[PDB]
């Protein structure tokens, strides 16, 4: 009676496991629901909108923005991106204090097992601080093939403190919460053959070990600024919040979002369609804080913000032509219905527009602030230069010199980067139309009118000694074109008869 | 014109990998492959001007040290299971009268072709490995 | 870089045979027959990057004594009733700085494929029995 | 030879203490291995390399009828023996070239995992000079270290299939 | 390998008559005329090894006084009604260390394939008369 379930296991609906990229599109959808995630639990990664609502409930808000962003059907995750939901303390943040606890480095399972497996007898010596140190000797390991049956059985060897393993983690936690410390680090007993040095939880071996604290605590609460603790964890990109941002907060959120280099995705209502200085958004446009986009919703439909940071961010940056617009861009959430005069308002103070055009879908993107296209895509860029350069002169593992040979190494790195976006669809050959400029007219205009992109790195001759030794190369200047996009199409026709 | 260079040989790097062993006397070199534009040719002054695609289209010929970090890196390029695609640059500075200029030269995707011709000798020394990149878009720029 | 050999030439040996008795003067030669990927190239920046099936297939032409052991080994392969196939290694031993390494070349299953062309003088000696085993795979490692 | 009939409880656990199994799959004969103790294929192809480099290198050194010498040249011959076995074996189905796993290793780091990486196996053989007179008139040469790399065997496949309606 | 010849040339009979007006400076030549095995390379370490049926054919390059017995004999072979067939040996002397082998080499049914081309001069005595005598095995033994 034995099944096919051994030897072919096939199974329906199961999440697949998601990890902090690298990508530009890890966007994130901040929330204000202590329910489920903690100031410890600042954020979680997502790749399934089943997965999202399993974990909070398809009841939940932040369910259903994940719904409206998972249904855009160019979907970020369709370029190897994720979502994440952060939090910030909305409300009064209760933290019910916890025990002390301990955890191993060594989350390899495999090589843990023969060590265990030849050792017999075992010695042992944790310290509950509750009382008398511990003195743990019976330890047989010969039994166990899964670190879950060693983890139950240091369970049954350490009074008042429960084990377990979590990937490959050994979680060693006291019953007593509060103001209770599990301070040894297994130790030593001079009683049997120790187990604490291959367990990797010696006080030599890395190990972190968070002392119970003393009671509750109560984090006030704090501001949507707090969006810098997120960032700070996960390194998202694109940004949002269940609320409604409020004006005083704009402008400090706009400077974040230029500053820690990532998108901002805001919607307003129609009361902000103005070119007042009082209006926040025209505020953004006139401060140039281009990072910080801002949208429209008659509605106030929150929602527009997910299906729209949705649709932006899908884009690979290593194929043939990648570089989307928005413009006109098929999104998950009912448009709705607006008179001319507020189109060309939107239009004109930077706003974006979800409305309808023959019974359609239709967005429509703004260039009063910046391009959608033209920030994003010089975002990616310069985050993926920053990244590029880093990556070659860390961990190539030959370090790069200031031989002159070398400093050609790191301009090319960029070079390469700059070709790999040309060869993209975010800059093109043509014109330079902008005065300023660096190195020659002659050879700046020429390589841009020619490669898209020129790249003049500073000679090791015009760095002093003082920043040589600093170990800081020159300052390579970059000068990129963007390539155009086509939103607009003018056309007149006579008629000879 | 008055022109004096930086950089002895054209310092190349490829795949962000720079080549640092070239073997003395003339070790690199572009070849254009084929034309940069066919005609046809008709009756009473006139032509037609085609630019080909194969217009970039270089071999670039590389020699190194018998066993060198270079050899190596080529190498290990050549023994792959699936054919390293190349990408990189071959750039001179040098000051045209007294402003520094630097002619660069692009080298995307290639590819070894020919492999060197492993000579080993007993009368002479010879540590002679010629590879061939041969790319497509070979754009000298200045 | 910094590199000196020991074993002058590179000790070889084919079907668990070494060769001893090397013409002097460049006896040993491998030289690639054909690329190792050929490519098409279509307009736009675009190519297509494709390993031949012929990639190691290299000839080795080999130079030994009129009448040696070596060429005694050679020849009873050339005269066998059924072609021999040849497996074995070239190979240098060679310090790169301080630590030695070595720098071995496989030869997979290969065949007589030129006789010598067997010339007698009386003018000037020549014991010059040059024979090509050439090979499919000659994956170089170092 | 008749298949038996087992639940599963003791399907799983002779999986995990290392015994095989033959038993009734879509009732048909099913032999199953196990990977507690090493795999089946992975014991014997390891057992049969080992003797088989064991008999080259004899075979090589005795009736071959010309002596190798501790010749440099002679030297890499030895080598070659071993290595042209060990091609034998990856162009035979149980070495495949690949990244290293382990840490420990022989020569040095670079050429170790380039060469199993590429060739699936490296062989390296001590130098003559590392060697002690006192054992060279023992007439044994270094000691080489070869090192090889399983092919993977495919045993489990496990796919999940969603239905978009 | 230590070696050492008797018998200045390799002494060469066709037809149970012996060559002995050779010129001097390098009179016979055996160059082989094709391979020994052609062979068709399939993917992934496959070959297939094929002795071709022209295996031994060798032309022998022979250069003789201009009016000789040697020529006189090659010549009347030229001139038959019939072309003769010619059948021999190349084969030389020669004492490996202290033993006394004899390297021979057969030549199966062969002819005339290329005439000497005649050439008489006056600035400077030319007697160089070229037969090329081509058979099809030539097995050298030793």
Redesign the interface.
């Given at each position: 009676m034995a099944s096919i379930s051994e030897v072919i296991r096939v199974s329906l609906q199961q999440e697949g496991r998601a990890i902090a990229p690298d990508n530009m599109n890890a966007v994130g959808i901040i929330t204000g629901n202590q329910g489920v995630l903690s100031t410890a639990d600042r954020y979680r990664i997502y790749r399934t909108a089943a997965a999202v609502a399993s974990d909070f409930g398809a009841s939940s808000q932040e369910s259903a923005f994940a719904n409206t962003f998972f249904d855009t059907t160019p979907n970020p995750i369709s370029a190897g991106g994720v979502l994440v939901i952060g939090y910030w303390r909305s409300a009064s943040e209760t933290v019910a204090a916890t025990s002390a606890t301990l955890v191993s480095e060594q989350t390899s399972e495999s090589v843990l097992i023969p060590l265990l497996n030849a050792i017999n007898d075992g010695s042992f010596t944790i310290t509950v601080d509750g009382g008398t140190e511990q003195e743990v000797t019976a330890l047989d390991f010969t039994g166990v093939s899964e670190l879950s049956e060693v983890a139950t059985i240091l369970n049954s060897a350490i009074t008042g403190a429960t084990v377990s393993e979590d990937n490959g983690y050994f979680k060693v936690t006291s019953s007593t919460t509060g103001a209770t410390s599990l301070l040894s680090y297994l130790g030593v007993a001079t009683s049997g053959t120790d187990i604490s040095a291959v367990l990797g939880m010696n006080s030599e071996s890395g190990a972190v070990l968070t002392q119970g604290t003393d009671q509750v605590v109560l984090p006030a609460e704090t501001k949507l600024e707090g969006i810098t603790a997120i960032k700070s964890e996960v390194n998202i990109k694109g940004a949002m919040f269940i609320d409604q941002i409020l004006d005083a907060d704009i402008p400090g959120i706009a400077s974040f979002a230029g500053a820690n280099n990532m998108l901002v995705y805001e919607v307003f209502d129609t009361g902000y369609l103005s070119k007042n200085v009082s209006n926040p958004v025209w505020a953004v446009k006139l401060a140039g804080q281009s990072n910080f986009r801002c949208l429209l919703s008659k509605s106030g439909n929150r929602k527009f913000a997910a299906t729209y940071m949705a649709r932006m961010h899908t884009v690979l940056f290593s194929g043939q032509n990648t570089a989307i617009t928005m413009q006109l861009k098929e999104l998950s959430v009912t448009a709705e219905e607006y008179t001319d005069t507020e189109i060309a308002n939107a239009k004109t103070v930077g706003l974006d527009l979800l409305t309808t055009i023959k019974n359609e879908q239709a967005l429509l993107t703004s260039g009063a602030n910046d391009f959608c296209d033209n920030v994003y895509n010089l975002e990616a860029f310069r985050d993926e230069i920053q990244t590029n350069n880093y990556n070659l002169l860390k961990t190539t593992s030959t370090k790069i010199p200031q031989t002159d040979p070398g400093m050609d190494t790191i301009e090319d790195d960029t070079e390469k980067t700059c070709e790999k976006y040309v060869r993209n669809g975010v800059f093109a050959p043509g014109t330079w139309t902008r005065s300023d400029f660096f190195g020659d007219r002659q050879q700046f205009v020429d390589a841009i009118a020619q490669k898209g992109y020129y790249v003049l790195i500073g000679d090791l001759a015009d760095q002093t000694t003082a920043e040589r030794q600093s170990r800081v190369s020159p300052v390579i200047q970059i000068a990129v074109k963007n390539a155009g996009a086509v939103h607009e199409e003018d056309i007149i026709i006579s008629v000879n008869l | 014109s008055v022109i004096v260079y930086?950089?002895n040989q054209s310092?190349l790097?490829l795949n962000?990998?720079?080549f640092?062993?070239l073997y003395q006397g003339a070790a690199l070199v572009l070849t254009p492959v084929n034309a940069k534009t066919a005609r046809t040719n008709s009756i009473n002054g006139g032509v037609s001007i085609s630019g080909r695609?194969?217009g970039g289209?270089h071999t670039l010929a590389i020699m190194v040290?018998?066993?060198?970090?270079d050899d190596?890196f080529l190498?290990?390029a050549?023994?792959?299971?699936?054919?390293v695609?190349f990408?990189?640059?071959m750039?001179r500075?040098y000051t045209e009268s007294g402003?520094?200029?630097?002619a660069?030269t692009?080298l995307?995707?290639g590819?070894?072709?020919?492999?060197?011709?492993?000579?080993?000798?007993?009368?002479?020394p010879?540590d002679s490995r010629t590879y061939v990149i041969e790319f497509?878009?070979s754009?000298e720029?200045?």
């Open positions: - | 930086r950089n310092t790097t962000g990998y720079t640092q062993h695609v194969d289209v040290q018998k066993h060198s970090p190596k190498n290990d050549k023994n792959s299971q699936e054919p695609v990408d990189g640059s750039k500075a402003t520094l200029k630097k660069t692009t995307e995707t590819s070894i072709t020919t492999q060197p011709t492993k000579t080993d000798n007993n009368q002479d010879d497509r878009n754009v720029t200045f």
